[PDB]
Amino acid sequence: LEVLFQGPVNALVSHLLVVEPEKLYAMLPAVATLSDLFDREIVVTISWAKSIPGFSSLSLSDQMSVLQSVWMEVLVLGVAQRSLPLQDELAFAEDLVLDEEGARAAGLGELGAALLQLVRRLQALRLEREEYVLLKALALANSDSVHIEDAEAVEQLREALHEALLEYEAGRRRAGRLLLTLPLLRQTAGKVLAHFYGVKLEGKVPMHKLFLEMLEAM
Amino acid sequence: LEVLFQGPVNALVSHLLVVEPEKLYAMLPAVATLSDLFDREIVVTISWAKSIPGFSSLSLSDQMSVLQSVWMEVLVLGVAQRSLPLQDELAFAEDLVLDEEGARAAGLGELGAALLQLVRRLQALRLEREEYVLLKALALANSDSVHIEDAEAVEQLREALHEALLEYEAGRRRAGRLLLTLPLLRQTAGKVLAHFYGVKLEGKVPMHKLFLEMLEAM
Amino acid sequence: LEVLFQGPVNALVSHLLVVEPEKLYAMLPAVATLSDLFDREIVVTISWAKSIPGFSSLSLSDQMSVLQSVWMEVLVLGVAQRSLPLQDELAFAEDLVLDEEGARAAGLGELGAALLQLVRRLQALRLEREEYVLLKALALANSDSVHIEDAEAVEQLREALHEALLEYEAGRRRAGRLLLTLPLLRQTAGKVLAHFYGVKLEGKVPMHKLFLEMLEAM
Amino acid sequence: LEVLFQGPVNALVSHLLVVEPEKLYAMLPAVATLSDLFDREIVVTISWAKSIPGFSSLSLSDQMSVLQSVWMEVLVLGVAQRSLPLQDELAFAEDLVLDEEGARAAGLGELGAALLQLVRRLQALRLEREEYVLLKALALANSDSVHIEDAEAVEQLREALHEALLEYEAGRRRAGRLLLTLPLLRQTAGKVLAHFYGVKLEGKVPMHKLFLEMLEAM
Amino acid sequence: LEVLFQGPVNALVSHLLVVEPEKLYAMLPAVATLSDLFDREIVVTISWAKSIPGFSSLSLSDQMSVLQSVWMEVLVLGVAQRSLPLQDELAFAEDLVLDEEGARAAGLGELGAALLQLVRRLQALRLEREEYVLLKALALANSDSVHIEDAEAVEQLREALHEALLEYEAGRRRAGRLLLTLPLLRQTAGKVLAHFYGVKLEGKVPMHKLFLEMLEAM
Amino acid sequence: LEVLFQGPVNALVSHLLVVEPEKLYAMLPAVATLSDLFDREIVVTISWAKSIPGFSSLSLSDQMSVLQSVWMEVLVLGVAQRSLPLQDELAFAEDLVLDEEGARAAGLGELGAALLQLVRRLQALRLEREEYVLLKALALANSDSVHIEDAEAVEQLREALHEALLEYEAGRRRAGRLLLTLPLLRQTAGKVLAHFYGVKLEGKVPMHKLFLEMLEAM
């Protein structure tokens, strides 16, 4: 899929819109149902990552290390986009919209406040559907994992996705305004991750679940 | 000092180079003397922020909230800059250069690894002194404190410093490459901050030390 | 208001009864409503402290340090007094009376047990309205903050409030019986504070909220 | 030994001075030898409590509950007393005097600061050996354990020791000034206790060590 | 009761079935009611332990140390047996059967998953009522407490209970298949114990409650 | 290698003795060099497991899940075996023998106590080299990972290794005495594992290191 880096950006952007995960439903929900949602959020994030141009050109160890470090940034950014046309509320699924009271009552502690701060930041910018999928693929390529063996290759992927974002905005402040929301994206994803490490849902460390599903898809 | 935003970028950049904190010595060093260093690092980070064009024109409450959230990012970025012409070592002071073994022996736990990861990232870019002081003022203005009242006024400061960094690079990928290191900068400063919260050196919470010093300078 | 230290104690005691915070209502309550209550508990504790004779004669840094260390002892003691005419229940607001089951179900963990132990201690003494306001002003002046610069001045304030309590009980075991409940008051307030640090309600460290409101009133 | 409560205070005070634990040496010291010291500190605190007039006349369950809650207050107060004629240093043993740098190097974290704050407080009072041993027996009797069955019987012990301290000072502000240092004593002992719980020296919870030794002496 | 070690195993096994704790009811339940259940689970485990042949032949200090280390393994194994004839559910009391959703909603965090893993292990073996009571008495005698003074005596008790289990299965893989579930039993009991340490129900450390009740029965 | 399960136990035992990891040297040692040792311990534990008859015939996901849960049990048991002919000391490497004081100074906290308790337990049995390698392969097969798909296939491996240990002891209490040390082995390895999770050496979670190395060898 690296031919998409060689061609014009429009076909890359459209590929990214087509590889967007299928909208997920939760079916107030019981924890069993939220656990099922989480499980499918993991599978979906992995199959998506495999369809990012360049990602599969990294070795399996670096593909895993990259995903461990940023898989929750991909999810959080998904939740944040779907929540832009909303006010003080978060779209955790197609049939699950929760304010800060419903977030904490659904068992997410104080993550609502952290996620809404990220939403407001993206809302202050009129984040387009096309930018969102360029920003999301770039957040994945911007991994800073200490476990990465081939750094050059990861750097190359990120430069290409950076270029792609510049080539989109071309045909200069706009590109940077989106990148400047990335520090908060990482910080908010670390908070979500730390929450679910603490919960340890059904006896399972999130890291341990991600590795096994990455192993199935790799 | 906002007359520096309406002029040519050269006068702003040299002003930022002029308001850099005075080089700090530690005088292997005893904790007492490292405590003293930390105490002086706090003081100089505050007087420096006071000299950032725009900052002083926020309300005192927003100035404190901004600094609490990013004061350690400003510190960490200082340390990483002075470490660019080094290999696997960190310049914590003019007379304190420690490798990862020395970092952990001096009582910084595993932060050495976290700080080197950030150093490498800045080294893979040939980061220049002028880019550094613009990135540093932009890190301060990119605060995401939940305690911020006037978000429009913070955004405005952030935009002007973003513009100023764009105007520096003008006279397209360069500015964005520097911005893409900001998420790791936030993450690394959060680790450092959490370290010192847990240490609670001399019975004192770093937050409680910062506020009192901010008080005196405001 | 230090003229109240020079005159007879009766006018000091009546001043303390008049500067007592206005009774607060919660309106089983949603967390948003409990968060609102907490926010107003902070504002109210600050304006009260400013009306304690002597407190404003300390420098702003010592006023803040003193309040950080004891603001929750002031609140806890408020809750405890209002709960003396009750049995195994706590008056958290005018319209919020909770037993140990309602305390834990309102999200206070096991703080109910800690607060009821303090209540029983004060109940075993028939704590008068007048003693309560002398004991409360004395708990504030008895701060042991490591951040206090002018210790002598804090010591002076506490000696005066101690005298005032002795001058009240005069016109010797009675005064000490009240002071001997102070260790448990501090311990119970530390527990409450540690709870709310853990909760980190809406992304906010209690310390960080107190400093900003102290900044508004100072 | 309750015949000492019906007589003149002089016979009680000299009895308290006589039942002081024998001065302890540590023999910079290795952890093994500091572990040995701690082990002996526990033993002597128990035999001392056994010799407090009143204590032995509680049920065994209330004696254990009382000691668990305040055994470290008794220890800490010993250390602070022996440190009164010192400056910025603590007498942990007859042959172990450590400043704050030595305290942290010997593995006590930041407790040195907490203990010095308490020392200063006792030093600002010209605390006398006779006042010290009365305050110490009164700290023990001021327990607030949730596990206490006979609260009336604990209260009675506490009242008698309060009275005895009043009768000592008689033959008005002096007794109250000593009582006002008790909240910091509790707070400091809780910090020390939490330190050693987290260390869990040789696999052993301090609570579990105290109970077994209390068992042997009961 | 060591005559039961000298006679034939059938009388030992029948003694163990007769000293089994009386079935407990909870009466979805309020926490007060679950707290009452817990309190009675402690009393019952202690009186049971005193009726294990050999246990009382250990000194009081070793009886306590042994019980502290394994009392929750005894409870957990009780819960697990009663749950063998169930599917994905746990019998916490006679009138309390909860699945993983009801376990977490009753306030047990993720202990349901840990307890069901232990149940499945015991179910894969058709654990008999007679084996269960031999396995339970052997888990108690298999204590690995660092506080045990007379190790030989504890070792002797465990060897006898091991023999007894071999003499039962005689009149070789069967005995070991049961012993191989013991590592998971300890691990699951440590998890339960750590949960209740964190909860600190009504201000009480489980260890501190067990010691006082052991003191009543000893 | 399952042809070793259908033959006489002698060929299996000598195969287990042959696939023992090559003796490891550390070269008081610097953390860097202890980090290097740990890195090599992980590698050899993986290649060893690959050589356990049965293991390689699980799916890759079950192989990883099994190893994650018991890799540290395998390590710990190695260290305890090499420590049998020592007193109050542990052989962490061929050139690293540390007592409890040295263990804590080398940065292992209080794990020395936990490991010696396990050593004593194995020493009270005259544990032989042949029993050790069978117990070690059986510890691996006794995994209780919640992530295990094919529980029947793990059970089968476990049964065969149990049988093999029974067949070794044949050619009745001996096998069971070795199995009764497994609960302490799990508990001790969990403590060690939790230590290194908290240390997070060089920014790396042990789980994340194991998975990547497992990846390479699979």
Ligand SMILES: Cc1ccc(-n2cc(CNCC3CCCCC3)c3ccccc32)cc1
């Ligand atoms: C115990 C417990 C189990 C499951 C969940 N839980 C799990 C999910 C799935 N989504 C995980 C993240 C949520 C934050 C944004 C990035 C993805 C969810 C969604 C909504 C409410 C709850 C909830 C929360 C708590």
Ligand SMILES: Cc1ccc(-n2cc(CNCC3CCCCC3)c3ccccc32)cc1
């Ligand atoms: C107990 C203790 C006291 C003091 C310190 N300690 C404190 C400092 C001061 N600088 C703080 C940060 C260091 C990381 C990069 C951003 C600034 C320092 C510098 C070098 C070694 C140690 C050390 C560490 C531990």
Ligand SMILES: Cc1ccc(-n2cc(CNCC3CCCCC3)c3ccccc32)cc1
């Ligand atoms: C998540 C969460 C949000 C808010 C609260 N919460 C906050 C308050 C306000 N009072 C704070 C302290 C409570 C203990 C006594 C000293 C003052 C309150 C009052 C009653 C119930 C709950 C509750 C608790 C938990």
Ligand SMILES: Cc1ccc(-n2cc(CNCC3CCCCC3)c3ccccc32)cc1
């Ligand atoms: C691992 C470790 C083992 C032992 C100790 N350690 C143990 C003691 C014994 N005294 C305990 C308290 C010390 C604080 C005041 C109340 C009594 C001690 C004394 C001096 C230095 C160290 C140290 C600290 C750390």
Ligand SMILES: Cc1ccc(-n2cc(CNCC3CCCCC3)c3ccccc32)cc1
């Ligand atoms: C706050 C809180 C109070 C009380 C309880 N709580 C306490 C018990 C009593 N049993 C304790 C263990 C439970 C796990 C298996 C071994 C025994 C119980 C039983 C069922 C649900 C809850 C619950 C849980 C949480």
Ligand SMILES: Cc1ccc(-n2cc(CNCC3CCCCC3)c3ccccc32)cc1
């Ligand atoms: C910071 C730090 C780095 C490395 C180590 N550290 C790491 C190792 C390697 N072995 C890990 C376990 C040790 C306990 C028994 C099972 C294997 C080791 C060996 C001896 C001393 C220290 C030490 C400890 C602490």
